[PDB]
Amino acid sequence: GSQGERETWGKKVDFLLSVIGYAVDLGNVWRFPYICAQNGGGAFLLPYTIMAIFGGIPLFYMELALGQYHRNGCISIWRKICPIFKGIGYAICIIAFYIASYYNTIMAWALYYLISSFTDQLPWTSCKNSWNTGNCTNYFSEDNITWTLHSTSPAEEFYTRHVLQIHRSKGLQDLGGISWQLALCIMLIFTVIYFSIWKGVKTSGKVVWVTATFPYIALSVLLVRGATLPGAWRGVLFYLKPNWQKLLETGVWIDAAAQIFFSLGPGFGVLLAFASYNKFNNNCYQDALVTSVVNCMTSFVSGFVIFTVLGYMAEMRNEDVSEVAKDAGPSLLFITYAEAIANMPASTFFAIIFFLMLITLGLDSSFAGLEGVITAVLDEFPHVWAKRRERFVLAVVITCFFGSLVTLTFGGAYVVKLLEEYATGPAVLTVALIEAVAVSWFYGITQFCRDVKEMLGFSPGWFWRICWVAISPLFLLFIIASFLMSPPQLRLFQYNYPYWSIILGYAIGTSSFICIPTYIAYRLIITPGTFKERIIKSITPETP
Amino acid sequence: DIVMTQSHKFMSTSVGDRVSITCKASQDVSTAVAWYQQKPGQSPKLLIYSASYRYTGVPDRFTGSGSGTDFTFTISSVQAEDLAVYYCQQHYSIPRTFGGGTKLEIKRADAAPTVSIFPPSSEQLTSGGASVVCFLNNFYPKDINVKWKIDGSERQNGVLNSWTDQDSKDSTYSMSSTLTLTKDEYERHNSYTCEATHKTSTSPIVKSFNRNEC
Amino acid sequence: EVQLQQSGPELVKPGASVKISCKASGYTFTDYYMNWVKQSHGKSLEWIGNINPNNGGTSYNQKFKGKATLTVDKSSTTAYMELRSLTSEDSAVYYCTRSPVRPYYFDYWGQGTTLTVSSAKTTPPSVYPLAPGCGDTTGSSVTLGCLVKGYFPESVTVTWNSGSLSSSVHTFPALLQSGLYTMSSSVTVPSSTWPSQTVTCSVAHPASSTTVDKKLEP
Ligand SMILES: CC(C)CCC[C@@H](C)[C@H]1CC[C@H]2[C@@H]3CC=C4C[C@@H](O)CC[C@]4(C)[C@H]3CC[C@]12C
Ligand SMILES: CN[C@H]1CC[C@@H](c2ccc(Cl)c(Cl)c2)c2ccccc21
Ligand SMILES: *[C@@H]1O[C@H](CO)[C@@H](O)[C@H](O)[C@H]1NC(C)=O
Ligand SMILES: *[C@@H]1O[C@H](CO)[C@@H](O)[C@H](O)[C@H]1NC(C)=O
Ligand SMILES: [Cl-]
Ligand code: NA
Ligand code: NA
Numbered sequence: 001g002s003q004g005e006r007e008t009w010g011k012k013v014d015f016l017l018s019v020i021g022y023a024v025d026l027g028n029v030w031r032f033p034y035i036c037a038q039n040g041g042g043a044f045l046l047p048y049t050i051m052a053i054f055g056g057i058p059l060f061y062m063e064l065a066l067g068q069y070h071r072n073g074c075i076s077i078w079r080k081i082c083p084i085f086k087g088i089g090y091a092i093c094i095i096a097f098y099i100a101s102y103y104n105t106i107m108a109w110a111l112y113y114l115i116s117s118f119t120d121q122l123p124w125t126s127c128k129n130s131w132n133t134g135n136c137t138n139y140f141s142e143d144n145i146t147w148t149l150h151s152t153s154p155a156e157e158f159y160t161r162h163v164l165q166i167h168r169s170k171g172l173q174d175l176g177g178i179s180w181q182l183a184l185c186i187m188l189i190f191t192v193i194y195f196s197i198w199k200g201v202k203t204s205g206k207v208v209w210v211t212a213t214f215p216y217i218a219l220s221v222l223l224v225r226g227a228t229l230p231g232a233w234r235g236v237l238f239y240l241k242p243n244w245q246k247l248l249e250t251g252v253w254i255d256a257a258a259q260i261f262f263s264l265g266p267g268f269g270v271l272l273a274f275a276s277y278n279k280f281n282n283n284c285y286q287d288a289l290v291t292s293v294v295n296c297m298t299s300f301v302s303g304f305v306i307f308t309v310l311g312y313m314a315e316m317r318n319e320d321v322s323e324v325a326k327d328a329g330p331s332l333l334f335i336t337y338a339e340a341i342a343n344m345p346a347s348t349f350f351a352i353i354f355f356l357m358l359i360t361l362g363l364d365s366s367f368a369g370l371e372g373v374i375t376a377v378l379d380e381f382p383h384v385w386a387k388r389r390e391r392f393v394l395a396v397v398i399t400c401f402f403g404s405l406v407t408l409t410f411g412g413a414y415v416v417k418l419l420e421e422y423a424t425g426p427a428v429l430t431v432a433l434i435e436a437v438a439v440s441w442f443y444g445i446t447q448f449c450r451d452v453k454e455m456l457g458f459s460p461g462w463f464w465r466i467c468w469v470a471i472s473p474l475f476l477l478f479i480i481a482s483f484l485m486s487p488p489q490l491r492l493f494q495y496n497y498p499y500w501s502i503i504l505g506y507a508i509g510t511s512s513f514i515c516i517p518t519y520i521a522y523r524l525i526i527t528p529g530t531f532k533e534r535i536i537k538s539i540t541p542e543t544p
Numbered sequence: 545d546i547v548m549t550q551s552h553k554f555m556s557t558s559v560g561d562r563v564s565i566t567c568k569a570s571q572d573v574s575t576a577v578a579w580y581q582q583k584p585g586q587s588p589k590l591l592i593y594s595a596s597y598r599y600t601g602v603p604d605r606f607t608g609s610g611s612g613t614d615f616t617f618t619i620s621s622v623q624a625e626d627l628a629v630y631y632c633q634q635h636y637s638i639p640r641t642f643g644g645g646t647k648l649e650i651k652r653a654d655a656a657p658t659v660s661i662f663p664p665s666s667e668q669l670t671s672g673g674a675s676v677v678c679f680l681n682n683f684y685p686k687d688i689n690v691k692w693k694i695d696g697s698e699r700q701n702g703v704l705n706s707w708t709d710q711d712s713k714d715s716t717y718s719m720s721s722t723l724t725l726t727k728d729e730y731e732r733h734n735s736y737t738c739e740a741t742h743k744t745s746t747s748p749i750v751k752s753f754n755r756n757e758c
Numbered sequence: 759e760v761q762l763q764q765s766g767p768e769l770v771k772p773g774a775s776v777k778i779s780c781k782a783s784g785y786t787f788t789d790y791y792m793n794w795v796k797q798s799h800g801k802s803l804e805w806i807g808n809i810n811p812n813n814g815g816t817s818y819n820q821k822f823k824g825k826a827t828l829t830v831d832k833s834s835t836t837a838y839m840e841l842r843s844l845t846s847e848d849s850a851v852y853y854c855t856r857s858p859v860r861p862y863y864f865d866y867w868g869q870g871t872t873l874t875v876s877s878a879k880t881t882p883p884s885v886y887p888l889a890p891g892c893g894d895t896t897g898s899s900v901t902l903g904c905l906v907k908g909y910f911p912e913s914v915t916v917t918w919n920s921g922s923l924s925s926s927v928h929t930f931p932a933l934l935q936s937g938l939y940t941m942s943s944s945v946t947v948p949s950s951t952w953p954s955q956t957v958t959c960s961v962a963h964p965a966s967s968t969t970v971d972k973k974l975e976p
Contacts, residue, residue: 144597146858146859146860146861147858147859147860148789148790148858148859149788149789149790149791149810149811149812149859150788150789151859231574234572315574317860318574318575318576318594318635318636318860318861319572319573319574319576319636319637320636320637320638323637323638576861578861578863578864580803580864587853587867587868587869587870588795588803588853588855588864588867589867590863590864590865590866593861593863594861599863599865631802631803633803633864635861635862635863638817639805639819639820640805640862641805642802642803642804642805643802644802645802658901660890660901660944662888662889662890662891662903663891664886665886665887665888665889665905667886667887667972668886668905671884671886673907675886675905675907677888677903677905677942679901679903679928679944681901681928681944681946704933704935704940706930706931706933706941706942707931708928708929708930708931718928718930719930720930720942720944722940722942753891753893753894754893757892758891758892758893758894
């Protein structure tokens, strides 16, 4: 009665592009070209696929299958599998809030850059502005110029002193106050995601049509543009030059594993929610396969889109694209690439489509990012929730805005690094390992192959059973152990993070998954009788 | 890394001729080549930067050309003070490497080597040694034979020939032939004689002196 | 104007360490990268590494990683380079040169530092005058000279009358034999100033800090 069965998706292509749009984001565009260039060049293509075939694809497919089979949220699905691990469904929620605290602000920057890209003369071309210093030296000026340790470029000046305004803060210690411009930008973004989420999967399935197809068009325009630029072969050479001695280093394998894990994004509850709304007899294998393989291919061509332009930039300057692509962060897009676009014909066009591309790269992923949590909460508190969806979605968008006010400060970029590298990563990897173990070693892999055999009509191959049993948990275990054994020393804009930053990162990191052990203790302490009977009634799913 | 290869280790030219030094790089360089000049006994001095551009305080006779991997440093009017070793260096990729170096030697007309023999001084006889010295000044080219004669017999042991670098005023080499001997042997012979064979004349220049208090 | 004054020559035993200074003047010291170029005897230039004076931002070469250590002092605008585990290959002339960030050229260099890594004892030079004989024919010009025998290392300076005049002085490169160097110098002066006036050759040895002056006597 009343609700009973849940709703279903409006078309196969909508869900196929929704998952693709969530999988593809900023990092696919710029993190993969950098990590591919600095870790063996073209030879990075070899371990990147292995970590996919053995690690990424099995987690992606197993998550999309569990989601499309059980049709439950990230929280209520554990009550029907392993109640003690229900805290997982909560942990991810908290995790999402941290991601949403910064991932949108980044887009805000692009948005503030987009609304600043409608002028006939781009603001970051000249030095006669209200934010430039006396060190600002630009081009279209007297030739012979020689760069100095204190000299700066109008683009670097525009990012540093105008939009980001990071010169007004001394670090994590002093970062206040808040920039109202980026607050309004992130409000507009939280509004464009509000009207794209508030109705449920109908609008995020209609809006995804645009958010997921535009980046390929923009990447195509930038691609055929950058291929025509003189001296673009240098960036391609630096992008594909095989350096097989890097493969001897045990670091590049960990870099590839981590990169393909985030980029694929299993273990977050997004694929669970997206798979939940679908036909029971609908095929899941082909969907997961195609989407992931596209997500990789798209990264691969994005590499060219970036390195052709950076090759042209190295030609205009003096070569060694590694020198011009030293900084691995937002500065590679907001300063370097932007300065390269400004020196091209129809600069307004390629700027509008570039920043618009960035925003459209981000939107689909935060759409999903919220979609998983909303689905989880609505499925965990039914009839206490779902009274309206707009109320909860609004409470989340607003919560993310107040959670992003720390990032909208002058030293907000500092917090972005802190949140992006020390907090979300190791916790998502941790909960992904816990989930992979619970589904593989608690619920039983044989019964899982039986559920896929019921849904798809055939039992999964031995390659996948042997992947879920041993290969995938060791795949996540390797990354977690590698990170925990040596957290990277953070540095951003000639500013090294204090030594206690990692403690703050761990505090944010630890505060996310306090619920899974405290919930195991909660259910283990609430259910009467012996601990063996409590863990037996707590590990085995509900019989009816 | 980058290998800047200068094939010609030595190049000969005359005062007023057009001389060009080549520089071969490993990979493509675009226009990131600098030319430095190091005079014998001085520190390198920057002349060209970014293939063709001249640095402040550099005469107009030094030029630069090339775009890619092979680059050329050209001197229009070679002067006597242009005698130095020239180096090319890439300034794009880390690390910055240099070339082998091309010592530009100046070619001119022949010159007669002024030979001057010198008897061991009294301060050295006081210390207990005696070295007859034979100087060869202002000649060209470098190839020149030096023969020693204690008392008519060709002396060959204890002779050290030291060739200096070319001159930066008149472009004339100079060398020193040293005959180091003991005091006891010096006071048992009287007239020493050193002769030099050069290409300016067929007859070797012969110099002689007497030990009996000159 | 822009001057880079390095330290003097250094004679050090193998296995020890040596530090070379580099006092900069004539420009904004915090504006340019400070570099160190190694030049071996008869070899080419060899870039060791640079350092950012604002924070000491060093950037070494893979070939010199763990071999050279670059430091900088902003209080006196002076750079330093320390070399440990010294061998025979390190006996060379080292320069410190200024350089901008882009284009990365070496606009101004130091005078150099002659480094000799050997266990040979610092031997004082024996200065013996080389005066023309009293039986020679005094023509339009007489050729004088002084002799330096037995010293180590290659650190010697032979001047003539405080550098006046020296428009015809020929200095011959030192020759190494049995662990000791030996060189000579000459000077062609007209016959209307000798032996009337005073012509005295000065021989300085910075390694042993010994300056012996000898006057020529026919
Ligand atoms: C979210 C909560 C639970 C985390 C709290 C953990 C505490 C112990 C961590 C988090 C942030 C950390 C602080 C971050 C800022 C500073 C300022 C610095 O000048 C001294 C270290 C100090 C004072 C750190 C001490 C340890 C610290 C206070
Ligand atoms: C999950 N793969 C992408 C998707 C978008 C983005 C992301 C992931 C999860 C969430 Cl909940 C959100 Cl809002 C956004 C992200 C962040 C860090 C690393 C990878 C990724
Ligand atoms: C240029 O930058 C330096 C530090 O990078 C600063 O000290 C200096 O004041 C700046 N110049 C001007 C004119 O502001
Ligand atoms: C280029 O810049 C320098 C300033 O360091 C200047 O002195 C020089 O004259 C300029 N021009 C050339 C051709 O080097
Ligand atoms: Cl990827
Ligand atoms: Na991705
Ligand atoms: Na996206």
